[PDB]
């Protein structure tokens, strides 16, 4: 459905869901979620037992998400390197959250944005960044992802 069917594993330690999934104690426990990247209109810390990164942002082509790629990647990566699990969520788990996860996948692989989107969709079929986020990801692939891959190597080996 258009808001998914529960949070979905994208890679080990990396999940995407909707806002309800992000407060679902059963889902959070089953998936061992200890970090939440919340990217939606009213993102703020809510639950106990969870490290948050909160990015108030709209699901619109006029919303800049590129300026949040680096902090999102650092947050996700440092969680995953410690063997912990991170949920990236938006309202629907379709666009804002998916875009940040695509940037992450592009940085930890050699993938362009389309192969990264394919990866996300294999785990969460409803993934579909808005057309503006798609263009931001294309620009990121063209001009900056190679700098991010080098930063990742320098900072984390």
Author numbering: -1 to 155
Copy text verbatim from the article accompanying this structure deposition.
DUSP22 is a small phosphatase containing 184 residues, and the sequence contains a catalytic domain as well as an N-terminal myristoylation site. This enzyme is broadly expressed in different tissues and plays important roles in the regulation of signaling pathways, such as inactivating the T cell receptor (TCR) signaling pathway, activating the JNK signaling pathway, and regulating the phosphorylation of focal adhesion kinase (FAK). The phosphatase domain of DUSP22 consists of five twisted β-sheets and six α-helices, and the structural scaffold is similar to that of DUSP3 (VHR), while DUSP22 does not contain an N-terminal α-helix surrounded by the N-loop. In this region, the catalytic activity is facilitated by C88 in the P-loop and D57 in the D-loop, and the hydrogen bonding network is formed by D57 in the D-loop, S93 in the P-loop, and N128 in the N-loop.
